[PDB]
Write a protein that binds this DNA or RNA. Structure first.
Ligand SMILES: Nc1ncnc2c1ncn2[C@@H]1O[C@H](COP(=O)(O)OP(=O)(O)NP(=O)(O)O)[C@@H](O)[C@H]1O
Ligand SMILES: [Mg+2]
Lengths: 619, 135
DNA sequence: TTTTTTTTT
């Protein structure tokens, strides 16, 4: 026994010397200082870093994990006591691990009884969750008959500590005086359990997927929900059971978690910040970004400018009396078949964080907004709050479902009042929609409003509407066909001919078709848009005067002069569209002020959207 | 008529009776021979065996991966412009390109050529123009 | 079990 005590003293001394080395080469003392300044209570270590300096500790920490981990946490407490900073937290300090596992990287299928008592790392999908509940750890009692204070500690099989005690709640003194609980001094901890299942990409065909149960406490609780793809590090252990003194030999097993990694976004370095400064200081950054958006699709330049404005977004105003004015931008595409509407929707789904895609073919309005299931259930536009919804085949939706969207696209709210449920829900998001015209193909002998075939109250809620036509014209046909075949004959420069798929500027651009002008890399696009989204520009007087004159001119213009025809309704919402597009353009310049240079581009884009010349079949 | 855009090739199967007499002789002789029966690259008749064909398809899919030659690309542009300016769409153009790549895959080629493009165009016309003529 | 009501398909 005394040899065991000497060995535990040696192991704790080794871990303490590693943690509090005089000149710390791994900077865990500075990380402890960061932890105590931030008020956190567990420290993350690299097992690969322990492996270099103390390999006899590191490999023993996998096989004999319980004793080694207890010794390491004791050494952490002594290292904290050597600081001039105070230990505020009433729960102890803890350790989590990362690194290379090798043998002990497993699945729910391959976790079997050979691994019991070892440290393991496992992967899967969360399928259940308990609600967070509080669990007693120590209890403090006051004896009013004697002015003494009594304390008691509690332990459980699910805890890492192997020690066990009576677990009876104390009520009386040894002299049988009654006792009073001190709730402000007793100690509790947050507790949660969940389960993980095999990933569907790894489960063998036909069979059912296998699953494992998990226990998490303290700061690890309230971190996951169903559907999360996770990697989990902990000790695999077994739990006995009893009924009336008779025991079945089949015991249950769990994972007691040390650390959780999420698998399902930005990254920066000062070289990247320098390059963002340079490109922002260049001559026409908005045009460069609009050209660089989606290079493998020919044409569609004005729609690409509109999509860039959608990805940047406008400014919300909340006034002094609580009134709100909308910030988001909404875009609709109608046109002939095979004109890349769905392709652009899928591209925006890749580029935008917090994005959801649906179709009008298989969506109810209840499922699109919110549902009663009694409980209340979120829909797609609620889930995409402060984000983007892409809707395809928007003409195939029913009007009963369409009328449910009218509140969301303007007020940013979903309100329900049905049996037993009365609630608001926030649904602030941007809508991007694609559709085909009424007749399945655009009729040139009828007006654009007749071909679109939707009511004015719905059409007014879109900031921009684009009508896309597939006109037969030998020049355009030749150019489009040449672009498509050039994209199809392409192969990477460092690739052999028989292979199969199972910096700032781009360098190979034959696939893009654009001959000489440069194009930015998509990773740089993601970084630039992420930074430029946070700029908060203000308006100015020249912008205000230009917007106010231009709005009246757009409303008063008469189309019988020019043989054009009107594509949109014009209401007071389009004035706010001008304001939103001006702020979105000013964001790309990293400007703090909106100017005439921004408002002129916004007007040119809106005036392109508003009017269209009559088709050649009618002319 | 909507989902016909999603299919690359379409056939209408459709006056057989004189030729069907010879076919009836052959098919009923096959079924009487099956009744008598009731009573490794090649088969006996020179056709490929299923166990070889399945393995060969599984081999080719993981190993070939072709591309078009520029001279093969030059014909399709003229064919497209001529058909469109004498229902022509980029979906049909990409379908023809896919069929030409598929024919070049069976020969285990590095590249597809004018030969494969012309056979792809013949197959596309023979299949698709039946729907233009009928119904 | 059988009966009655309100949301959803
Ligand atoms: N420059 C281009 N212009 C148009 N189509 C292109 C271009 N380049 C490629 N395509 C192809 O044309 C198709 C684009 O149409 P797609 O986005 O799939 O459906 P859609 O445009 O929404 N028509 P639909 O869904 O029937 O209403 C794809 O097969 C693309 O590969
Ligand atoms: Mg589509």
């Amino acid at each position: 026994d005394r040899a065991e005590d000497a060995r535990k003293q040696e192991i704790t001394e080794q871990y303490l010397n590693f943690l509090d080395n005089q000149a710390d080469t791994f900077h865990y003392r500075q990380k402890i200082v960061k932890m105590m300044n931030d008020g956190e209570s567990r420290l993350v270590m690299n097992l690969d870093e322990i492996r270099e300096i103390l390999p006899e500790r590191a490999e023993g920490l996998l096989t004999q994990s319980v004793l080694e981990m207890n010794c390491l946490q004791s050494a952490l407490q002594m290292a904290i006591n050597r600081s001039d900073v105070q230990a505020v937290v009433k729960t102890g300090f803890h350790v989590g691990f990362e690194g290379t596992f090798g043998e002990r990287h497993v699945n729910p299928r391959t976790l079997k009884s050979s691994y019991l008592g070892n440290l393991v790392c496992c992967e899967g999908i969360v399928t259940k969750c308990s609600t967070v509940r509080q669990k007693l750890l120590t209890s403090v009692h006051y004896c009013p008959a004697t002015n003494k204070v009594l304390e008691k500690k509690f332990a459980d099989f699910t805890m890492l500590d192997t020690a066990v005690t009576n677990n009876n709640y104390p009520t009386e003194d040894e002299n049988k005086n009654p006792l009073e609980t001190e709730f402000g001094h007793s100690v509790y901890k947050d507790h949660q359990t969940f389960t993980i299942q095999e990933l569907p990409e790894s489960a063998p065909a036909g069979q059912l997927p296998r699953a494992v149960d998990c226990v998490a406490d303290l700061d690890l609780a309230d971190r996951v929900k169903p559907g999360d793809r996770v990697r989990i590090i902990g000790v695999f252990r077994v739990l006995p059971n009893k009924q009336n003194g008779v025991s079945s030999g089949s015991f249950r097993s769990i994972i007691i978690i040390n650390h959780i990694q999420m698998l399902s976004i930005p990254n920066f370095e000062p070289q990247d910040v320098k390059d963002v400064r340079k490109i922002s200081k260049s001559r026409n950054p908005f045009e460069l970004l609009a050209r660089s958006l989606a290079p493998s699709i020919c044409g569609h330049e004005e729609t690409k400018k509109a999509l860039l404005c959608l990805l940047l977004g406008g400014m919300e105003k909340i006034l002094n009396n609580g009134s709100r004015l909308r910030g988001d931008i909404n875009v609709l595409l109608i046109g002939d078949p095979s004109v890349a509407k769905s392709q652009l929707l899928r591209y925006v789904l890749r580029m935008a964080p917090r994005a959801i895609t649906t179709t009008g073919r298989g969506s109810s309005g209840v499922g699109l907004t919110a549902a009663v299931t009694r409980r209340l259930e979120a829909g797609a536009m609620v889930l995409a709050d402060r984000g983007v919804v892409c809707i395809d085949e928007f003409d195939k939706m029913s009007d009963i479902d369409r009328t449910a969207i009218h509140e969301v696209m303007e007020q940013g709210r979903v309100t329900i009042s049905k049996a037993g449920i009365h609630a608001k829900l926030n649904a602030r998001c941007s809508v991007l929609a694609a559709a085909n015209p009424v007749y399945g193909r655009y009729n040139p002998f009828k007006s654009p409003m007749e071909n679109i075939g939707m009511q004015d109250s719905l059409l007014s809620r879109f900031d921009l509407i684009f009508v896309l036509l597939d006109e037969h014209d030998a020049d355009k046909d030749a150019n489009v066909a040449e672009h498509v075949l050039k994209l199809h004959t392409y192969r990477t420069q460092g690739e052999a001919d028989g292979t199969v798929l199972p910096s700032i500027y781009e360098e190979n651009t034959q696939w893009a078709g654009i001959q000489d002008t440069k194009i930015l890399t998509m990773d740089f696009m993601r970084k630039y848009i992420h930074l430029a989204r946070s700029v908060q520009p203000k308006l100015t007087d020249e912008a205000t005067e230009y917007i106010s004159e231009v709005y009246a001119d757009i409303r008063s213009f008469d189309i019988t002069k020019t043989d054009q025809e009107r594509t949109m309704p014009v209401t007071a919402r389009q004035l706010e569209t001008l304001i939103r597009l001006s702020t979105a353009i000013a964001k790309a310049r990293f400007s703090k002020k909106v100017e005439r240079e921004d408002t002129e581009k916004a007007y040119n884009l809106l005036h392109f959207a508003c009017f269209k010349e009559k088709p050649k079949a009618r002319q | 008529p909507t989902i016909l855009s999603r299919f690359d090739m379409i056939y209408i199967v459709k006056h057989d009776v004189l030729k069907d007499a010879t076919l009836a002789k052959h098919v009923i002789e096959v079924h009487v021979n099956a009744s008598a029966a009731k009573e490794t690259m090649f088969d006996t008749d020179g056709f490929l065996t299923i166990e070889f064909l399945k393995k060969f398809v599984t081999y080719a899919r993981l190993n070939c991966g072709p591309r078009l030659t520029p001279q093969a690309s030059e014909k399709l542009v003229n064919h497209y412009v001529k058909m469109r300016n004498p229902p022509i769409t980029v979906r049909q153009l990409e379908a023809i390109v896919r069929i030409a790549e598929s024919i070049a895959k069976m020969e285990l080629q590095q590249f597809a050529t004018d030969k494969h493009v012309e056979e792809a165009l013949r197959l596309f016309r023979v299949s698709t123009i039946e729907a233009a003529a009928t119904g």
